[PDB]
Design a protein around this ligand. Structure first.
Ligand code: W0S
Ligand code: W0S
Ligand code: CA
Ligand code: CA
Lengths: 204, 204
């Protein structure tokens, strides 16, 4: 009876890990496709499964960070969303913190996404008329060429500027979608998705 | 590209069905064991997975009803919980409605659980000093021997009575746990739990 309960809890932890990988794959795909409502519902499922997990493997921590990163990027223009205990931290700043924490290769794409999030973290505040908040995000992030141009843009209180058209929110999303395609390819062989695909293919 | 998206959505629906059965099994086990916090977290995961489902098979509808039934029974003494659009319906009344809707055998255990929920739906109101609400639940449910004894008990405004000790909340829970053990045995062979158990056993 005691061994039975033990084996059952271990089996629930295995299944929870398989559910986490499948939900991360589904979340990545909804993000890449721009399926906003599927992303919302999948995100809710992923959060609930993660709340039911205890200690994590390095792989599971990376998967959770990817889910959290996409959630913040999706909420990047929702300045009312509070992702950190410190209520001042904006969604793009929270995404930047996770991006710098993930155990992943720092290739050129990594740095380009990093710099696009830094620029857009300021741009989203400016576009909302939140000029003082844009200066506070700048101080928190920056923590010379990009830096000084950004401070000049903030000080000129322009709700829109040329620099933000070149390092745009759409540019940031496309670069992130390139990384999401890699995560999708990497996770498409995980157990639950492989098993479900084999079932669907067998019915053709 | 269009066929790929189609196959992927079908595979997500297969995996969602497997997640629903596993979460129902886990929910049943937490209910049977009295693991309140695991029941809360599993219930949250089950609700989120169900929100991500569209059309249901007869089997999936029965699984959802079992999850909803246990959720209401667990909340049976939480008279502040609103499970129906009609705000007057108490959690035990909502459990009774689902119990009468499930495509299941109406064996002696079915009727005993049914009658225990009817009695306790009144008992929980009386124990809270909600005498008028107890009369309203009685009218909605009842809808001769049990019926007339219950109306007499309600009219005597006793926060506690002998009849409710014989057809007690604990008696109701034990009878329901007997049915949950059957559901557990029936669902223990579902795909995700079988696969996870095979992994755990292979590591011994
Ligand atoms: C130990 O650390 C975490 C554990 C869980 C599991 N519920 C979730 C977490 O974040 C949602 C964690 O922080 C990374
Ligand atoms: C068609 O009917 C239902 C469908 C779903 C799927 N989200 C959930 C349901 O209840 C939670 C339903 O009612 C039984
Ligand atoms: Ca804000
Ligand atoms: Ca109430």
């Amino acid at each position: 009876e005691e061994e039975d309960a033990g084996l059952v809890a271990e089996a629930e932890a295995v299944a929870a890990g398989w559910m986490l990988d499948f939900l991360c794959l589904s979340l990545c795909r909804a993000f890449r496709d721009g399926r906003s409502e599927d992303f919302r519902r999948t995100r809710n499922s992923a959060e609930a499964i993660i709340h039911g997990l205890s200690s994590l493997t390095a792989c599971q921590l990376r998967t959770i960070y990817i889910c959290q990163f996409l959630t913040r990027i999706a909420a990047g223009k929702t300045l009312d969303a509070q992702f950190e205990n410190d209520e001042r931290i904006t969604p793009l700043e929270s995404a930047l913190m996770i991006w710098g924490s993930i155990e992943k290769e720092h290739d050129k794409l990594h740095e380009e996404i990093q710099n696009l999030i830094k620029i857009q973290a300021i741009a989203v505040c400016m576009e909302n008329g939140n000029f003082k908040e844009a200066e506070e995000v700048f101080e928190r992030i920056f923590g010379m060429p990009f830096k000084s141009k950004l401070l000049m843009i903030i000080s000129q209180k322009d709700t829109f500027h040329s620099f933000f058209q070149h390092f745009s929110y759409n540019h940031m999303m496309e670069k992130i979608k390139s990384y999401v395609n890699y995560v999708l390819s990497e996770k498409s062989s995980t157990f639950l998705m492989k098993a479900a695909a084999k079932v669907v293919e067998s019915k053709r």
